[PDB]
């Protein structure tokens, strides 16, 4: 069946859709199609083309109120070239994170963002992490979200020497900076930095 309405979605609304690049882009919802119990959403993007997308691959083009965001909420967020990329809410605003949202992006990256940097996915899966492609990231997120608020983390201080994983091996590294539940690691040989979640198994003390 072709529908005009489905939940709070309405044909002709402006929306965000996930392109094959895995980045998300502005478009118009031009059809809603059902095949038995399944639903698909046809989006005409502003620049490039039409896609027929599942409901977990479209997002509303507004910022959600804080009371609709939980740990485990499926979102699209500003990713640092600024793109929109999918992720999971790991923390909501509190004193210890200076009232920011912590996002775990689908590729394993973590960042603090503000409400104005977030968009809600329209039809998230019941287990929101189940559409994370990478099995290792998917399993990590499942454990994190379901164990929350029980969060094993390593206490780290600037100047501390540790081993950090990159491309499957351990590297000598130094803590450069700490920000909430994130640590900025300097890889000593490569002399570049990366922000990493303090409960990541990439930090040798967590492994």
Curated annotation (Swiss-Prot):
Widely expressed. High expression in testis. It is found in: Nucleus; Cytoplasm; Chromosome. Degraded by the proteasome, shielded by interaction with ATF7IP. The conjugated-Ub is protected from deubiquitination by the SET domain. Residues 68-128, 155-207 form the Tudor domain. Histone methyltransferase that specifically trimethylates 'Lys-9' of histone H3. H3 'Lys-9' trimethylation represents a specific tag for epigenetic transcriptional repression by recruiting HP1 (CBX1, CBX3 and/or CBX5) proteins to methylated histones. Mainly functions in euchromatin regions, thereby playing a central role in the silencing of euchromatic genes. H3 'Lys-9' trimethylation is coordinated with DNA methylation. Required for HUSH-mediated heterochromatin formation and gene silencing. Highly up-regulated in Huntington disease patients, suggesting that participates in the altered chromatin modulation and transcription dysfunction observed in Huntington disease. Its down-regulation has salubrious effects on patients, suggesting that it may be a promising treatment in Huntington disease patients. Belongs to the class V-like SAM-binding methyltransferase superfamily. Histone-lysine methyltransferase family. Suvar3-9 subfamily. Part of a complex containing at least CDYL, REST, WIZ, SETDB1, EHMT1 and EHMT2. Forms a complex with ATRX, TRIM28 and ZNF274. Probably part of a corepressor complex containing ZNF304, TRIM28, SETDB1 and DNMT1. Interacts with TRIM28/TIF1B. Interacts with ATF7IP and ATF7IP2; the interaction with ATF7IP protects SETDB1 from proteasomal degradation and is required to stimulate histone methyltransferase activity and facilitate the conversion of dimethylated to trimethylated H3 'Lys-9'. Interacts with CBX1 and CBX5. Interacts with DNMT3A and DNMT3B. Interacts with SUMO2. Interacts with MPHOSPH8. The pre-SET, SET and post-SET domains are all required for methyltransferase activity. The 347-amino-acid insertion in the SET domain has no effect on the catalytic activity. This is Histone-lysine N-methyltransferase SETDB1. It comes from Homo sapiens.
